[PDB]
Amino acid sequence: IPATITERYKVGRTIGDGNFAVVKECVERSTAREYALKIIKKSKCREHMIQNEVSILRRVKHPNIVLLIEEMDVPTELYLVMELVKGGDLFDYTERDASGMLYNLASAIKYLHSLNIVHRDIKPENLLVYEKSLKLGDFGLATIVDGPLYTVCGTPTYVAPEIIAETGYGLKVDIWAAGVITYILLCGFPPFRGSQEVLFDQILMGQVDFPSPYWDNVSDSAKELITMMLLVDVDQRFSAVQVLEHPWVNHQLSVAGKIKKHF
Ligand SMILES: CCN1C(=O)c2ccccc2N(C)c2nc(Nc3ccc(N4CCN(C)CC4)cc3OC)ncc21
């Protein structure tokens, strides 16, 4: 850790240990304010999968997206001081609670889409909870849409069918991932479960089903919203605006004791 960081910040324990970065909690010495420190290891050769994610982060300012406070660039790694969300991810209850979560998620997705940004890795692990409100994070896979995209990326559970097809995709792959998440929030398991290729062939059909007994006491409005969010026809599929105008975003759920089993 370089002296430039420690002069102003006090790095602490590790709260995020992915394969692509390290996150730690830290305190600004001047103001005794908590923040998060993202440490991104650079390639041993002296670069654009890091710079791009930073270029994205300098443009995003929304109450439902983890905020970039400041950045320090160093030869071996790049240090990002970001806002700290102390609640944990989506894993860490009612249709009323879940509907507010999609509202936060769709407000972020709507904001990003106005800047032609596609997140391409929206999943529960990348959604953080303030004590509830959600905040979207990890813009490593985000990119600006200037044309159809053909790169297959993201965790296969939340990947849209047109990504699997490799025919071209765009801004509406984030609505699909949000639909899968909302589906999970209501019953605790994913719409397409598979049995590696079986999952891909299942998603490509796009048969969203609400089985019994889990989906019996969930409103038809949520079913209608989820079905419109998970439409294989991209043109028909809902936009972030269409999701936010839906009445379900504007009854206890037996969901936890099954999220721990499936994930
Ligand atoms: C650099 C900014 N940032 C992201 O960009 C970010 C984006 C996506 C995912 C994780 C991120 N990291 C790690 C972030 N994680 C958090 N918060 C957070 C999270 C988890 C925990 N625990 C750790 C201990 N185990 C046992 C329970 C959970 C504790 C946390 O805060 C105290 N606030 C901001 C993040």
In three-state form (DSSP H/G/I as H, E/B as E, the rest C), the secondary structure along 129-181 is EECCEEEECCCCCCEECCCCECCCCCCHHHCCHHHHHCCCECCCHHHHHHHHH
Last residue of a domain, one of 60, 84, 108: 84
Q: Are residues 227 and 132 in the same domain?
A: yes
Q: Which resolution in angstroms does this entry have?
A: 3.1
Chain mean position to CA 238: 18
Contact call for residues 166 and 152 (beta carbons, < 8 A): yes
Q: Measure 82 CA to ligand 1 centroid, in angstroms.
A: 10
On whether both 128 and 157 belong to a single domain, the answer is yes
* Same structural domain, 178 and 207: yes
Residue 72, ligand 1, Cβ within 6 A:
no
Whole-angstrom Cα distance, residue 227 to residue 248? 13
Does the C-beta of 84 come closer than 6 Å to ligand 1?
yes
Q: How many domains does the chain have?
A: 2
- Where in the sequence is the domain holding 9, given as residue range(s)? 5-84
Q: Which of 128, 133, 155 to mutate to test the pocket of ligand 1 (most atoms within 8 A of CB)?
A: 128
Contacts of 245 (CB under 8 A, 6+ apart): none
User: Among this protein's residues, is 201 annotated catalytic?
Assistant: no
Distance of alpha carbon 118 from alpha carbon 178, whole angstroms:
13
Q: Which residues are bridge partners to 89 per DSSP?
A: 128
The four Cα atoms 256, 261, 262, 263 give a dihedral, to 10 degrees, of 80
Joined together, the tokens standing for residue 263 give 């994930």
Q: For residue 48, give the nearest of 166, 140, 170, 176 by alpha carbon.
A: 140
Q: Which experimental technique did the depositors report for determining this structure? A: X-ray
What are the φ/ψ torsions at residue 98 (nearest 5 degrees)?
A: -65, -35
CB 136 within 8 A of CB 64: yes
Question: Could you tell me where the beta strands, DSSP code E, fall in 9-62?
Answer: 9-17, 22-28, 33-41
Q: Which residues contact 58 (CB under 8 A, 6 or more apart)?
A: 68
Task: Look at residues 84, 104, 133 and tell me which one is the last residue of a structural domain.
Answer: 84
Binding residues for ATP: 15-23, 38
From residue 2, give the alpha-carbon distance in Å to each of 7, 40, 81: 9, 13, 13
Q: Please check whether residues 164 and 127 belong to one and the same domain.
A: yes
| Cis-peptide into 213, omega within 30 deg | yes
Q: Does 134 share its domain with 258?
A: yes
Q: How far is the C-alpha of 98 from the C-alpha of 19, rounded, in Å?
A: 30
Instruction: Determine contact, residues 129/87, Cβ cutoff 8 Å.
Output: yes
Q: Which long-range contacts (CB under 8 A, 24 or more apart) does 55-59 make?
A: 56/117, 56/139, 56/142, 56/143, 56/144, 57/82, 57/139, 59/115, 59/117
* Domain C-terminal end among 20, 52, 84: 84
Tokens 């998060």, located at residue: 36
Of residues 73, 89, 97, 121, which has the active-site annotation? 121
* DSSP reduced 3-state for 78: strand
